[PDB]
Amino acid sequence: SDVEEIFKTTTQEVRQLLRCDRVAVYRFNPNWTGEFVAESVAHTWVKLVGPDIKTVWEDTHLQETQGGRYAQGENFVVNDIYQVGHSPCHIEILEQFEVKAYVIVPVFAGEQLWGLLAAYQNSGTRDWDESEVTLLARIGNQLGLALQQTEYLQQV
Ligand SMILES: *[C@@H](C)[C@H]1/C(=C/c2[nH]c(/C=C3N=C(/C=C4\NC(=O)C(CC)=C4C)C(C)=C\3CCC(=O)O)c(CCC(=O)O)c2C)NC(=O)[C@@H]1C
Distance CA 130, CA 8 (A): 24
Q: State the residue range of the domain holding 155.
A: 1-156
Q: Among 59, 78, 98, say which to mutate for ligand 1: greatest number of ligand atoms within 8 Å of CB.
A: 59
**83 Cα–ligand 1 center, Å:** 16
Distance of CA 58 to the CA centre of its chain: 15
**90 Cα–ligand 1 center, Å:** 5
Distance CA 47, CA 87 (A): 27
Distances (CA, A) of 148 to 12, 87, 110, 143: 21, 37, 6, 9
Ligand 1 atom with the smallest distance to the CA of 70 is 30
84 in contact with ligand 1, CB cutoff 6 A: no
Domain count, the chain: 1
Q: Experimental technique used?
A: NMR
* Buried b / exposed e along 43-76 (16+ C-beta atoms within 10 A): eeeeeebeeeeebeeebeebeeeebeebeeeebb
The closest residue, in CA terms, to atom 16 on ligand 1 is: 118
Q: Find the CATH number of the domain harbouring 77.
A: 3.30.450.40
36 in contact with ligand 1, CB cutoff 6 A: no
If phi > 0 it is left, if psi is from -120 to 50 it is alpha, else beta; for residue 62 that is alpha
